[PDB]
Design an enzyme around this catalytic site. Structure first.
Site, PDB file in Angstrom:
ATOM      1  N   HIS A 199       0.841  -1.202   0.000  1.00 25.91           N
ATOM      2  CA  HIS A 199       0.000   0.000   0.000  1.00 25.91           C
ATOM      3  C   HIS A 199       0.879   1.256   0.000  1.00 25.91           C
ATOM      4  O   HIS A 199       0.483   2.288   0.570  1.00 25.91           O
ATOM      5  CB  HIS A 199      -0.954  -0.033   1.199  1.00 25.91           C
ATOM      6  CG  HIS A 199      -1.919  -1.176   1.161  1.00 25.91           C
ATOM      7  ND1 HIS A 199      -3.225  -1.046   0.712  1.00 25.91           N
ATOM      8  CD2 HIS A 199      -1.785  -2.470   1.558  1.00 25.91           C
ATOM      9  CE1 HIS A 199      -3.846  -2.211   0.840  1.00 25.91           C
ATOM     10  NE2 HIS A 199      -3.010  -3.076   1.371  1.00 25.91           N
ATOM     11  N   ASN A 239     -10.251  -3.039   2.606  1.00 22.19           N
ATOM     12  CA  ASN A 239      -9.845  -3.072   1.170  1.00 22.19           C
ATOM     13  C   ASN A 239     -11.156  -2.920   0.387  1.00 22.19           C
ATOM     14  O   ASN A 239     -12.241  -2.897   1.015  1.00 22.19           O
ATOM     15  CB  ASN A 239      -9.191  -4.434   0.808  1.00 22.19           C
ATOM     16  CG  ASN A 239      -7.683  -4.523   1.219  1.00 22.19           C
ATOM     17  OD1 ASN A 239      -7.057  -3.535   1.548  1.00 22.19           O
ATOM     18  ND2 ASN A 239      -7.101  -5.705   1.085  1.00 22.19           N
ATOM     19  N   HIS A 244      -3.522   0.724  11.768  1.00 22.92           N
ATOM     20  CA  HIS A 244      -3.243  -0.656  12.190  1.00 22.92           C
ATOM     21  C   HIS A 244      -4.523  -1.266  12.783  1.00 22.92           C
ATOM     22  O   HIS A 244      -5.105  -0.670  13.698  1.00 22.92           O
ATOM     23  CB  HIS A 244      -2.040  -0.664  13.191  1.00 22.92           C
ATOM     24  CG  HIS A 244      -1.781  -2.019  13.813  1.00 22.92           C
ATOM     25  ND1 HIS A 244      -1.029  -2.992  13.193  1.00 22.92           N
ATOM     26  CD2 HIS A 244      -2.267  -2.591  14.943  1.00 22.92           C
ATOM     27  CE1 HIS A 244      -1.051  -4.107  13.921  1.00 22.92           C
ATOM     28  NE2 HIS A 244      -1.756  -3.875  15.010  1.00 22.92           N
TER      29      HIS A 244
HETATM   30  C1  HDD Z   1       0.420 -10.246   8.273  1.00 26.85           C
HETATM   31  C2  HDD Z   1       0.654  -9.411   7.241  1.00 26.85           C
HETATM   32  C3  HDD Z   1      -0.562  -8.670   6.672  1.00 26.85           C
HETATM   33  C4  HDD Z   1      -1.726  -9.184   6.282  1.00 26.85           C
HETATM   34  C5  HDD Z   1      -1.997 -10.720   6.254  1.00 26.85           C
HETATM   35  C6  HDD Z   1      -2.586  -8.088   5.817  1.00 26.85           C
HETATM   36  N1  HDD Z   1      -1.886  -6.911   6.042  1.00 26.85           N
HETATM   37 FE1  HDD Z   1      -2.530  -5.031   5.472  1.00 26.85          FE
HETATM   38  N2  HDD Z   1      -0.565  -4.248   5.931  1.00 26.85           N
HETATM   39  C7  HDD Z   1       0.449  -5.004   6.519  1.00 26.85           C
HETATM   40  C8  HDD Z   1       0.361  -6.346   6.888  1.00 26.85           C
HETATM   41  C9  HDD Z   1      -0.639  -7.222   6.533  1.00 26.85           C
HETATM   42  C10 HDD Z   1       1.550  -4.133   6.786  1.00 26.85           C
HETATM   43  C11 HDD Z   1       2.822  -4.833   6.296  1.00 26.85           C
HETATM   44  O1  HDD Z   1       1.712  -3.930   8.237  1.00 26.85           O
HETATM   45  C12 HDD Z   1       1.196  -2.735   6.209  1.00 26.85           C
HETATM   46  C13 HDD Z   1       2.152  -1.922   5.301  1.00 26.85           C
HETATM   47  C14 HDD Z   1       2.969  -1.234   6.372  1.00 26.85           C
HETATM   48  C15 HDD Z   1       1.784  -0.791   7.206  1.00 26.85           C
HETATM   49  O2  HDD Z   1       1.752   0.100   8.088  1.00 26.85           O
HETATM   50  O3  HDD Z   1       1.072  -1.926   7.299  1.00 26.85           O
HETATM   51  C16 HDD Z   1      -0.137  -2.937   5.682  1.00 26.85           C
HETATM   52  C17 HDD Z   1      -0.950  -1.992   5.099  1.00 26.85           C
HETATM   53  C18 HDD Z   1      -2.271  -2.145   4.763  1.00 26.85           C
HETATM   54  C19 HDD Z   1      -3.122  -1.016   4.304  1.00 26.85           C
HETATM   55  C20 HDD Z   1      -2.706   0.466   4.082  1.00 26.85           C
HETATM   56  C21 HDD Z   1      -3.118   1.416   5.215  1.00 26.85           C
HETATM   57  C22 HDD Z   1      -2.538   2.754   4.877  1.00 26.85           C
HETATM   58  O4  HDD Z   1      -3.177   3.475   4.075  1.00 26.85           O
HETATM   59  O5  HDD Z   1      -1.455   3.137   5.434  1.00 26.85           O
HETATM   60  C23 HDD Z   1      -4.346  -1.516   4.099  1.00 26.85           C
HETATM   61  C24 HDD Z   1      -5.590  -0.762   3.616  1.00 26.85           C
HETATM   62  C25 HDD Z   1      -4.371  -2.911   4.381  1.00 26.85           C
HETATM   63  N3  HDD Z   1      -3.079  -3.290   4.811  1.00 26.85           N
HETATM   64  C26 HDD Z   1      -5.524  -3.671   4.214  1.00 26.85           C
HETATM   65  C27 HDD Z   1      -5.468  -5.031   4.392  1.00 26.85           C
HETATM   66  C28 HDD Z   1      -6.548  -5.978   4.165  1.00 26.85           C
HETATM   67  C29 HDD Z   1      -7.976  -5.694   3.678  1.00 26.85           C
HETATM   68  C30 HDD Z   1      -6.081  -7.184   4.455  1.00 26.85           C
HETATM   69  C31 HDD Z   1      -6.926  -8.453   4.344  1.00 26.85           C
HETATM   70  C32 HDD Z   1      -7.569  -8.737   5.471  1.00 26.85           C
HETATM   71  C33 HDD Z   1      -4.702  -7.085   4.945  1.00 26.85           C
HETATM   72  N4  HDD Z   1      -4.364  -5.731   4.893  1.00 26.85           N
HETATM   73  C34 HDD Z   1      -3.891  -8.141   5.331  1.00 26.85           C
END
Ligand code: HDD
Ligand code: HDE
Ligand SMILES: [S]
Ligand SMILES: [S]
Lengths: 726, 726
Positions: free
Chosen positions: B101, B174, B365
């Protein structure tokens, strides 16, 4: 076992043309291509086949598909250290991108000089024609992020890391011979002006916005490099087909201690070639990785990028003999005045293994010089010397960035520096200071000398007061822009006019457009009037009478400033789209493919779906991509063989392919009944220059087509495209 | 070097249509728009007008044009602390982008519920229809870097930070209701597979490459969210015209302690709308910032993005009542089975001031919940709880990220945590531990209770052994893909077929394409056949005999899964291109603009050059952009008024503009002699549904055009576009 039984998952370890095999890491694609640097990286290269999957601590993993939980539908447990190590590493993959040139593509290769240059420089890498120096080169854009598009309009970076026996030398150049500004103190102002604007972070990869042209309008020193960026120089066809320049006067220092002023050049042995604007812009959408891809695939194909290093040399006594200051980085040295002396050849012949580890982490900096080279007082160069070491401390996490494997010297390095984050070297020296007696003062200083000596600066005379003052000698802004303008062909001038017009059209505040048009009127009235007409602006009587700036040392043009005025085309490594039909005349295709192959020109066979078609004689023809999947933007010419033309005659994508290629001035060849497509692009019965046509693809049909490709584009078609709906 | 006398450098601080004024920081554009969060940022907002330029240390700068040197052509001196500070700040501007993202666009707004939800949740922000909660929302793509393009095919992120009185709640969702994978442990494998491949770092912003399709072919659990990505859901028209979902089952907890399972929804009040692929892809080149720009300009115009929060609620006793597992994030809950209950409305009504400080540093988060909400054992959600806190330590430089202004709660926060890099809060508490007597134990724990209580986890029963094992109830992969497919309109289905066909055609290893087509044969034979045909693949007899998966609890389809099956159009905020000629019929333009104004539809006036043209009645018409500068990609419909049509009748760009709009299914309206353009797009005299035509632009003519725009695109035209060469 998930790999296919036939072994088709793995690319052959032999040179193969673009598209024929999946691409791979350099050491797997070309394991026998070696150099001293590539060999020295062996200690850190990590394979995979036949090895167990482990944590980073070496513990074998049994189930890499699940988290540990209490019950198979229950909560995940904190004691799952396998999960947390894996997600931790992922969560921290990213490092800060480069502040500028964040978007860049890199490759390994080697350099060799044609002859010893000992009479003018004691630099070891230039001392002996049999001395081979490994290099790592990164090419880049300037404004956009690491995930921005390749074929934007921008300046390109051309950075070469020379791993010499007397230390790393980094020649950190660009694809134009000057820069937008005179003094390093203004670099954050200029960069902020060109970069996405700070309220909303738009636009990416583009100078076509208010703040850039506001800055330019208030800072006429910028106009020279702006002329270059608005020209087709700003949109190269390939990193293989642009020039390179070292931007500043530096010095060479010989064993006798004489200094010679030098500017550095790279001549592309594949010739100079650029895109046209509509093509380059559309291509950022259809393939934003087009130059990264093209570089990688040229190297996989054996079409190694080759460049000749050249020097413009100016004796110390002639410092003041030009109308412009040699230290002013907004000024070029015309090759009519000071020719480029050929020095040696660089060949890039192997891709990296891991892009992050070798490309993203590479650090280049123009202060990394070696004995035999030295700086000058160029005040942009002077401030660069501070920036390129400082910026690594955040980008690469600390002061040990030279221990990152790609960055390491192959020359010995030993000193009393210690510690810092990520320290790899374990120093056994009892002493961490000098002078010391407890290690007999080792490692020791080395007097300068003719070879293998310590670095000593040339003893340039300094005299003046401590001032923040621009030299008066730098206060001339229009003659170099004018020299560049007058050196371009009429079609190049037209593309410059169109670049300024298009960009200024995206400037929302009209007064900024007007102010830039005023500056243009100080360079050349024809240029100013044509841009004005496109913007609906009328020059004032005053503007119409601004007297033009002086010739540059009596020059009214210098053809070496043009991409195209002196032909230097090379077809090897170029590519041709071949539009198939479901019953191709197999004799046409045999003649086409073999003629292309004999000149090292690639082909891609296209159709309206993937899979195969069968020729008139039963030959099965594998399809590389669909018409929409691999647009004419991606090729240099288009050939349509005869056969069942009715199959594709009414296919909108097939027709559009020709219209798009036609609009962008690309050679097009039509054999047999493929000539029915003439109606699509409006070609007269008796034909036109730039369209190859015959009853069949034999005889002179392929020679004529190759002759057109050698001249790159059909500039004569420009007035005809004007009215094409494509 | 200053502002024009006429004040034209500065945008009006009033709502204005897109392109009418330069865009500006939110606090300058809309200074009267406030909420509690926006106000609390006033401590750190920094102005500029009437202030002296200084170093960061508050020292006024006299000359910001030059480095300090010894003589005006001399070397730069190390004592130039003004240069070094300036350059050092610049050298260290970039921070790591988000692992996923990284590309995203954000705005401020507010939320309020429609009615108290105290029967189902004690969450304070849902307790009272008149309690307004400030929000900051970020929309994103997933795969590409922060400098990648907006209109890629990808999932979109939709993250909302609620600054509630009982703490920050982040709903991090999402634009599709499921995810590709079941267990967080696999997240780095899936994200690596979709990201640019590690050897060469290609392709950006695209799943259309071998590793992604390899992983999908080997992990059938991914097929549901793949179906969504390949549909037009993957290419939204605007962040204002996509749905949002919370992705997992969470819990609501009421004052009595009762748990209800909940899935979150956001309904776009501007309706659901997407691009078509050729348009989306071309628009990544013509304006890689299109969604970022459109969002910003909608807010500046007063077309505030509005969304309705909605909950699917399942009682605890109903956990096992469906034929899928509630905790499986590859499964959606069909609205036919569990209706969405409307909960409240969110309005985004102010842009940020500085994209870096507020957007790039924002940290969202999904573990940031508040009393009244809780988690479930969804094994994807479980592992997300670890990652979103961990990743901040490198991305935002340490554990004090909550003190970055955008991240600060408006609710009080006090605890015993101390230090960390760039610690802002200066704690006066004599104690930094509890229990303590020296500060009488403050700040103190708070028992849970109906309102303003301490957080306590719902006491869910856990029974099972410590296992790394996927629940058997998660092992069904084809019924939801199939339900989705069957719920789409015939044109949506064609677009899904075309998305799979386009993407697989860019997979180089053919066995991967074959394996994906075999998966498709397990979902629906019609879909599988249509993709196979485009790839030149023939299904085997066995493939033809694969039994379709079961219905989902008796459903044959659910129309809420379609973007278009149930009309929900809203034209307000949409935009029309009006192609000018040098003597516009002013009477046509009057009626055109009046009708568009009545429905809140914007217009951009386009011509073959910039500047002005004058209408038949003397009205001077400023030109927004040229035909080439603002292509039909960027608008919803095209109108060509009458007048001196000969001026543009043979203009290649004007003609293409209509061919492109036509190909992309957009409504086109032609008045008077503009009807001559019918020939370029082959409309018969009788007319065609989707082309509005008449002697002049009148009541009837604009009503028809507006009705077509309310239906978004002219799907009936699809059979006729194969043929157009555009
Ligand atoms: C275990 C790892 C993992 C999993 C399985 C998911 N995410 Fe995630 N997500 C992250 C780990 C992550 C992250 C690596 O922590 C991010 C990028 C760095 C951030 O701060 O978080 C992130 C960012 C991130 C963002 C961006 C928020 C922003 O604008 O800063 C969104 C909208 C989502 N995720 C949405 C989802 C959705 C709908 C998922 C399905 C349920 C999902 N994520 C699963
Ligand atoms: C002559 C070619 C040229 C010129 C005139 C400049 N750049 Fe470059 N640049 C950095 C700073 C910097 C300053 C201070 C100035 C003039 C004062 C220039 N540039 C103009 C940098 C921010 O320190 C930089 C960013 C990351 C990094 O390591 O250094 C940087 C990058 C850069 C590259 C890319 C090298 C690479 O890693 O691929 C190139 C080719 C240039 N600059 C050329 C250059
Ligand atoms: S330069
Ligand atoms: S999800």
């Amino acid at each position: 076992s998930l790999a296919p039984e036939d072994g088709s998952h793995r690319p052959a370890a032999e040179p193969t043309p673009p598209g024929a095999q999946p691409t791979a890491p350099g050491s797997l694609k070309a394991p026998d291509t070696r150099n001293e640097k590539l060999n020295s990286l062996e200690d850190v290269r990590k394979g995979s086949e036949n090895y167990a999957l482990t944590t980073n601590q070496g513990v074998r993993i049994a189930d890499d598909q699940n988290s540990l939980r209490a019950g198979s539908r229950g909560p995940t447990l904190l004691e799952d250290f396998i999960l947390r190590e894996k997600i931790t590493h992922f969560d921290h993959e990213r490092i800060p991108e480069r502040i500028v040139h964040a978007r860049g593509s890199a490759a390994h290769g080697y350099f060799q000089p044609y002859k010893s240059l000992s009479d003018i420089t004691k630099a070891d890498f230039l001392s002996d024609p049999n001395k081979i120096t490994p290099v790592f080169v990164r090419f880049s854009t300037v404004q956009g992020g690491a995930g921005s598009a390749d074929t934007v309009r921008d300046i390109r970076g051309f950075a070469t890391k020379f791993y010499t026996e007397e230390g790393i030398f980094d020649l950190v150049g660009n694809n134009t011979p000057i820069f937008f500004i005179q003094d390093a103190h203004k670099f954050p102002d200029f960069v902020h002006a060109v970069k996405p604007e700070p309220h909303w972070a738009i636009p990416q990869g583009q100078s076509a916005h208010d703040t850039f042209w506001d800055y330019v309008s208030l800072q006429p020193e910028t106009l020279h490099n702006v002329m270059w960026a608005m020209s087709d120089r700003g949109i190269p066809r390939s990193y293989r087909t642009m020039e390179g320049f070292g931007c500043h006067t530096f010095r060479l220092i010989n064993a006798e201690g004489k200094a010679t002023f030098v500017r550095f050049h790279w001549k592309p042995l594949a010739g100079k070639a650029s895109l046209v604007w509509d093509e380059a812009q559309k291509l950022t959408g259809r393939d934003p990785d087009f130059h990264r891809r093209e570089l990688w695939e040229a190297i996989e194909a054996g079409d190694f990028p080759e460049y000749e290093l050249g020097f413009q040399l100016i004796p110390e006594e002639d410092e003041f003999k030009f109308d412009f200051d040699l230290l002013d980085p907004t000024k070029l040295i015309p090759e009519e005045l000071v020719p480029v002396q050929r020095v040696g050849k660089m060949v890039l012949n192997r891709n990296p293994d891991n892009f992050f580890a070798e490309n993203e982490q590479a650090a280049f900096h123009p202060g990394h010089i070696v004995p035999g080279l030295d700086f000058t007082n160029d005040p942009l160069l002077q401030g660069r010397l501070f920036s390129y070491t400082d910026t690594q401390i955040s980008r690469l996490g600390g002061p040990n960035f030279h221990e990152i494997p790609i960055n390491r010297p192959t020359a010995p390095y030993h000193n009393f520096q210690r510690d810092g984050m990520h320290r790899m070297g374990i120093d056994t020296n009892p002493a961490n200071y000098e002078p010391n007696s407890i290690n007999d003062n080792w490692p020791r200083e080395t007097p300068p000398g003719p070879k293998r000596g310590g670095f000593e600066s040339y003893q340039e005379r300094v005299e003046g007061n401590k001032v923040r003052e621009r030299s008066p000698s730098f206060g001339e802004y229009y003659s170099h822009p004018r020299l560049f303008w007058l050196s371009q062909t009429p079609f190049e001038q037209r593309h410059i006019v169109d670049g300024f017009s298009f960009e200024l059209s995206k400037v929302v505040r009209p007064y900024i457009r007007e102010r830039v048009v005023d500056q243009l009127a100080h360079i050349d009235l024809t240029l100013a009037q044509a841009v004005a007409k496109n913007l609906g602006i009328e020059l004032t009587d005053d503007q119409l009478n601004i007297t033009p700036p002086p010739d540059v040392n009596g020059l009214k043009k210098d053809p070496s400033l043009s991409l195209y005025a002196i032909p230097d085309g090379d077809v090897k490594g170029r590519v041709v789209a071949i539009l198939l039909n479901d019953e191709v005349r197999s004799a046409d295709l045999l003649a086409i493919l073999k003629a292309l192959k004999a000149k090292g020109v690639h082909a891609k066979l296209l159709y309206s779906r993937m899979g195969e078609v069968t020729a008139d004689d039963g030959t099965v023809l594998p399809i590389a991509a669909t018409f929409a999947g691999a647009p004419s933007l991606t090729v240099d010419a288009v050939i349509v063989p005869a056969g069942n033309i009715a199959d594709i005659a009414d296919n909108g994508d097939a027709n559009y392919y020709l219209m798009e290629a036609y609009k962008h001035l690309k050679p097009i060849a039509l054999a047999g009944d493929a000539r029915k497509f003439k109606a699509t692009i409006k070609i007269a019965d008796q034909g036109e220059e730039g369209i190859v046509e015959a009853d069949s693809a034999d005889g002179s049909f392929m020679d004529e087509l190759l002759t057109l490709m050698a001249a790159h584009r059909v500039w004569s078609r420009i007035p005809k495209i004007d009215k094409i709906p494509a």
